[PDB]
Amino acid sequence: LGVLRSANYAEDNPLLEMDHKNVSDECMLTLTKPAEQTITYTVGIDKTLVGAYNGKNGTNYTPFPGDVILTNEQLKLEKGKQESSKAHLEFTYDKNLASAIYLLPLIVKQTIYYRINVWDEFAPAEYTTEPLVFTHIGYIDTENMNPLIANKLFYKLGREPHLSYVHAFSVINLLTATVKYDQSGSMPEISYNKDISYVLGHAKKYIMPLQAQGHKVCLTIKGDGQGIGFSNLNATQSQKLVYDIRKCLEIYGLDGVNLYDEDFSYKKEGDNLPSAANLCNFVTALRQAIDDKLITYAMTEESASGLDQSQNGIELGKIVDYAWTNQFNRLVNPWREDNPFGDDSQWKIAGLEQTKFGALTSTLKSLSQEEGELMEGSIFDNILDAGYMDLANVFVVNSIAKVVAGVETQGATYLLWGALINYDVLQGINPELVPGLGKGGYLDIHSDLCPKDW
């Protein structure tokens, strides 16, 4: 008696994601008792087991009809060991394969039941039009990343026969344009680096495809450190930047703008100081100009004080679609007194419903043991124990970045916290980021999922 396991997957019957390329896995035999003598078993394909599997598990899988190349099919079990040598399975992709989930049973002659998801041209098999239950906002740094990677990241929701695939993000923020003085040194203008220019100049290639798959796409605007920005514009300057932002979203088919309140290098003394009232007047003007296009606000330690109070009757929270902070890998709760994780009252925005606040903005950085405990504690205790459920509606990822050495642990989890709370805990639906594991997945440090091509 023994078990035919996968070498890289703990799932008894692993589900591989085949996006128009081959997929592979290795399996081995684990014997309940150590081998008395050196024996060799052989693994083979038996597609006759499919009908019994679909009856037992309620599924509808058709046996995988593509070419399957098994190498090292003879499993060597040395005396005294319980695990054999590893066989290798290469599932060949071909255009003659329709998009579906297939089954390929591998037997000893127990049994392992490989499931192969053959993707369509836009989404995996069993993709659904069912919308994500929460708003997931993803930054893409156009200096290193292709915005189209959003169209490759999915959530595998549920367990068979109730599997569903949904896009992992619903809003995408493009990093970044900046605000600086104009050539005459009197007016603010938007400045675009070489990367964000090519993205916007080719919005038909990089933006409309995202919008076609349900993504709202916004342009982020930071400062360029010349001391002029969203919170210190006079009447004339405000009308200029409002006009230019309104024009920019119309010109490139953008759904909205993300006001990233950082890097303006505001002076601490002089005649153009930052004020929360100026910010409220500028954003109020922006809202009149762009109508229902999205305005979001990213708060930082460089934000002006007073946003917890109305400014000339204006509450910034009433006129913005979403807000969040740069307090990465930590759940910020500005409405919680005696907060055991730290007082976040500085991040309070007057008029902002909790359901519009990204309490958790995660970033791709390795965390210490303490930092890791702070992240999970702040998330769980605030949303479940303290009862701030409304803080589970918006989740933000500041830069979907490449998974590399030293950030594999955060890479695997920092895009799943919103699905973890909303689906796995608040409902019973298991969530998995796809395409994660395996050669070529988002978590393969030697592969780029959807690389920069300009």
Author numbering: 42 to 150, 163 to 507
Paper text:
The genomes of Bacteroidales contain genes encoding glycan-degrading apparatuses that typically co-localize in discrete clusters known as polysaccharide utilization loci (PULs). B. thetaiotaomicron contains almost 300 different GHs belonging to 60 different GH families, and secretes at least six mannosyl-glycoprotein endo-β-N-acetylglucosaminidases (ENGases, endoglycosidase hereafter) that hydrolyze the chitobiose core of asparagine-linked, or N-linked, glycans (EC 3.2.1.96). Here, we discover an ENGase from the GH18 family in B. thetaiotaomicron, BT1285, encoded in a distinct PUL with its own repertoire of proteins for catabolism of the same HM N-glycan substrate as that of BT3987. Altogether, our data suggest that human gut microbes employ evolutionary strategies to express distinct ENGases in order to optimally metabolize the same N-glycan substrate in the gastroinstestinal tract.
We found that PUL16 also encodes another putative GH18 endoglycosidase variant, BT1284. However, this protein contains non-conservative substitutions of both acidic residues in the catalytic site, thereby lacking the canonical catalytic DGxxxDxE motif of bona fide ENGases. We found ENGase-like proteins homologous to BT1284 throughout several Bacteroidales species (85 sequences in at least 20 different species) with similar substitutions of catalytic and substrate binding site residues. By enzymatic activity measurements using complex type glycans (from both animal and plant sources) and HM N-glycans as substrates, we confirmed that BT1284 and one ortholog from Bacteroides faecium (Uniprot ID: A0A6H0KVH8), which we named as B. faecium GH18-like, were indeed catalytically-impaired. To better understand their lack of catalytic activity and glycan binding ability, we determined the X-ray crystal structure of B. faecium GH18-like to a maximum resolution of 2.67 Å. The crystal structure of B. faecium GH18-like revealed the presence of a TIM barrel fold typical of ENGases from GH18 family fused to a β-sandwich domain in the N-terminal region (DUF1735), similar to BT3987, as well as a β-hairpin motif common to GH18 enzymes with specificity towards HM N-glycans. Structural surface analysis in the putative glycan binding pocket of this ENGase-like protein, revealed that HM N-glycans do not fit as well as in a bona fide HM endoglycosidases. Together, these data indicate that ENGase(GH18)-like proteins were unable to hydrolyze or bind N-glycans in the assayed conditions, but may they still play a role in the metabolism of N-glycans in HM-PULs from Bacteroidales by some as yet determined mechanism.
